[PDB]
TrEMBL record:
Residues in Beta-lactamase class A catalytic domain copies: 17-233
Biological classification of the source: Bacteria, Pseudomonadati, Pseudomonadota, Betaproteobacteria, Burkholderiales
NCBIfam families linked to this entry: bla_class_A, blaPEN-Bcc, blaPenA
Classification via InterPro entries: Beta-lactam/transpept-like, Beta-lactam_cat, Beta-lactam_class-A, Beta-lactam_class-A_AS, TAT_signal
Secreted in keyword set: no
PROSITE patterns in the record: BETA_LACTAMASE_A, PROKAR_LIPOPROTEIN, TAT
Species name: Burkholderia multivorans (strain ATCC 17616 / 249)
Protein name stated in the entry: Beta-lactamase
GO molecular function, one term: beta-lactamase activity
Gene behind the chain: ampC
Domain of life, source organism: Bacteria
Amino acid sequence: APASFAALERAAGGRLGVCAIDTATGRRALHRADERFPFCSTFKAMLGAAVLAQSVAHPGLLQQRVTYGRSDLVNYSPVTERHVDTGMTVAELCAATIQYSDNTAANELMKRIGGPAAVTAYARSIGDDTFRLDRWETELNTALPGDLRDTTTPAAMAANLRVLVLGDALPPAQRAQLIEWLRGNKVGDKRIRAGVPTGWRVGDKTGTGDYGTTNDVGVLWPPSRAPIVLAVYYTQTRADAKAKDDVIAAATRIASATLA
Ligand SMILES: NC(=O)[C@@H]1CC[C@@H](NOS(=O)(=O)O)CN1C=O
């Protein structure tokens, strides 16, 4: 098996980006940590945080029912497609978008809170000047080489996760909620979760896009040691490239070994 990030990139082809932070010591494991990558679904973690942050000023926000129609449904909406008739609450849409990566849920939340610009504004509010959300689902996953729309860096996303999950960017109640949503990711078993020991607990958000883009970002809680924050981004040369779950699992093993 490839033993370094550089070696893994050469084996897999494409372009790999990693930022892993050992929160005990502040040591980092890095590869292209300051390069931009298309974030795809991983922004949904930021979207959830942005909604929770708005809920601090308006506690009733999470309660609000959002109704949407058949024509609002975009591809990959396994939860929202079941509730065209009732609609769903803001909190329900957050859980759906983070835990099942539901695309319509993301769009409907963004309509409520002020669109792509609102998520970008939220990123700036927590000290992320790098993140930019430009488009809606599913266009934001085009992942075109050379396009800066809908990108961030592994280092910027890892820093966001550190302050959101382990820091005080959110008040305790909202911080606890974000953690519950991330720990409940249902669609990431073959990625970060596949590259850590089963004793480690994971809260994460995956993403996948065109150009075989394969991403996963989150926080890892080892049983007897301080948490590690891990952001992994990966993208490939051909537009029809296949996503590579195993690249993320391998990057995770290397990061966890390095910070052992
Ligand atoms: N093209 C997309 O919108 C992809 C693919 C399917 C959904 N979930 O994928 S995941 O890698 O986030 O688990 C949503 N998504 C997020 O990147």
